[PDB]
Design a protein around this ligand. Sequence first.
Ligand code: 4F9
Ligand code: 4F9
Lengths: 239, 239
Amino acid sequence: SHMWIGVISLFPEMFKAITEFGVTGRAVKHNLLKVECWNPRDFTFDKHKTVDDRPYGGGPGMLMMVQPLRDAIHTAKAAAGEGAKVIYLSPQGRKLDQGGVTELAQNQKLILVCGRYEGIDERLIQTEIDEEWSIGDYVLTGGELPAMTLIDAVARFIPGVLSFADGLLDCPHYTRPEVLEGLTVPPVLMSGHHEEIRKWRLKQSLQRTWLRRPELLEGLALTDEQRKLLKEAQAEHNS
Amino acid sequence: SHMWIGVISLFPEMFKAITEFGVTGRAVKHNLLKVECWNPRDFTFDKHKTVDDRPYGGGPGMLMMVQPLRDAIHTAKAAAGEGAKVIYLSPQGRKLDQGGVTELAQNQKLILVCGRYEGIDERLIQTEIDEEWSIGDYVLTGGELPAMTLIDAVARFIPGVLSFADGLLDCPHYTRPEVLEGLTVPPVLMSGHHEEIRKWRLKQSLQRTWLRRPELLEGLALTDEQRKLLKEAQAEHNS
Ligand SMILES: c1cc(-c2cnc[nH]2)ccn1
Ligand SMILES: c1cc(-c2cnc[nH]2)ccn1
């Protein structure tokens, strides 16, 4: 099932990073994912194509100019037709996580508004934006990398495109050679015992989540098997 | 003060998104930031330039092939000289936040290793990586967008390149026109009263943090002024 994502950005060429390369580049080429960009600069009318403006109240920064940005959004909305969710990427938004990604991926159409400078007029958020989303508690130079991050994450859910599946960190992975700077591959992985290997990997995920991100465990209802392997991992750690 | 960032990636052209555009593009052009990429594909020797390999123990995915990736890392380390911190971008890493960004930005040299497929051999993390970092609890198709995100965030700290400064969400911002779809600019911002404007903005930040991200407040030692304005905001909310 196709996903269409409209993008509003002063730097649309940044999105070549996801539309021209890798898994996401394939998804675009195969028409599984469509990414369409509108640049507020194209909606300006003055000679110098001005896209920023001064904040009321003063301050050292600038904001996105309202008229070109508003017009770009309206154009994207018209192209989307009915049912597109309009998202503003900002640190004031809902924190993105895999559960949030799964939710966003349920939309067939999204419009992603990328801010630059000190951001956008609050009244545009009120009148034009459906949801604000943050990719993390850090400050960037613009909304483009967050938008690309969001697109990449939701793209993985599109059929044909391709251990947080159960909320745990991933297990360690090994490939050739069998010995690397004196470090050997765990023999269980060489055993060909599919069930032993499954349980080892799950136990490692549980142990790594417990040691690195114990808060993630509290959010889970562990299966009987997971409870057992976690107990074993914690016992081995204390021995 | 210059920052040098070495990048190991199968898709180095993705990094044009930050080296050719905007604030980060300027930083690169002005030699404030140098980004240098090595591609494991260039370190292969077989006819088909193979960069992936099968995981021991089976499973549906592939891993980065060790030899080309290892050789690329060693080459980057040699180019960096002494004192470069080597970072692997992964969901199993330390969660990036602004405090973490400030810490990373203290390094004059960084090497960022971007994984693809199901990631990299655990023994390479042991032997080659100094720190693992995550940009958030979501799964992407590769480490490139996280690396670019990290670069963008740390770049803001480089002198000459340019409200989490005190750990709060930002205040609303307004620009022209004075009225937008019936919504007016708060009169205080039109007053020209610099101290009233400062306090209004701070109060708004406190109110927005309290309503949207109350957990962020618990991590703060509020100033007397902040305690007062937060109390006022909470009173007005309950009235
Ligand atoms: C979403 C947006 C942003 C951001 C936009 N402009 C500066 N920072 C940061 C994180 N997640
Ligand atoms: C850092 C790396 C990753 C990632 C790398 N490969 C798949 N996901 C996700 C978030 N932060």
